[PDB]
């Protein structure tokens, strides 16, 4: 049974990269990142930044999640993210994602002892 | 460091009363949510009552509802019970906490060590 930060980690995690370079970044990692094992993730982020930095986000300002929640946390500076969405032709189970790369604060939803990230709520 | 202060728990007679307060200091921002949640001996952690920064959504466990009441200072990152009519069933370190949402344990992310409120029969 996969913990709940494990999954924010493979969801939306890539330390490894400064940004996505490619158009299909996306294609590759939600394959890579079992995100079209059983349906195809409609969207879904990934955060180009060390797991310190973001961790660090549930120690930094509290903000409403957009289900209106409240345990909610929005990055202090700046940070490099992708999107991905489904194209409009994607269908299980071929899936396919524009890929969209940017600058930008993140919000994140945290939880646990050890408090770390759970959901990756919103960009801005 | 965010230092979490907690006062006014000890002993105390049954149908007493017990005046809980808790700051966090050294958090740059405001807790939307601040709680309180007790753990007896020899049992898990449960929620008491949590209020949010503007004064509401304020919201009661059923065990203690009309017998003790949370305010908050507004828009600051202070947190107060209230506590009346108590019982041997209230008898637990009570612990404060910011951050979460409602009183969803998991959710919270900054616990003060604790008062211990004792309530003799």
């Known amino acids: 049974k996969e913990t709940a930060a494990a999954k924010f980690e493979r969801q939306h995690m890539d330390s490894s990269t400064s940004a996505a370079s490619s158009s299909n970044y996306c294609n590759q990692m939600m394959k890579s990142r079992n995100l079209t094992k059983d349906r195809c993730k409609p969207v879904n982020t990934f955060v180009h930044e060390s797991l310190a930095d973001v961790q660090a986000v549930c120690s930094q300002k509290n903000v409403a999640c957009k289900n209106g929640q409240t345990n909610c946390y929005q990055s202090y500076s700046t940070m490099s993210i992708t999107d991905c969405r489904e194209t409009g032709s994607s269908k299980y189970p071929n899936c396919a994602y524009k890929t969209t790369q940017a600058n930008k604060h993140i919000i994140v939803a945290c939880e646990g002892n050890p408090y770390v990230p759970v959901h990756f709520d919103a960009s801005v | 460091q965010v230092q979490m202060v907690e006062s006014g728990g000890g002993l105390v007679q049954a149908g007493g009363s017990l005046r809980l307060s808790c700051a966090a200091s050294?958090?740059?921002?405001?807790?939307?949510?601040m709680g309180w949640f007790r753990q007896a001996p020899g049992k898990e952690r449960e929620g008491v009552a949590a209020?949010?920064?503007?004064?509401?959504?304020?919201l009661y466990a059923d065990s203690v509802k009309g017998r003790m009441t949370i305010s908050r200072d507004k828009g600051k990152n202070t947190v107060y019970l209230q506590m009346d009519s108590l019982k041997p069933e209230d008898t637990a370190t009570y612990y404060c906490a910011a951050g979460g949402y409602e009183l969803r344990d998991r959710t919270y992310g900054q616990w003060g060590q604790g008062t211990q409120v004792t309530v003799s029969s």
């Open positions: 050294g958090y740059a921002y405001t807790y939307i949510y």
């Open positions: 209020m949010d920064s503007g004064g509401g959504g304020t």
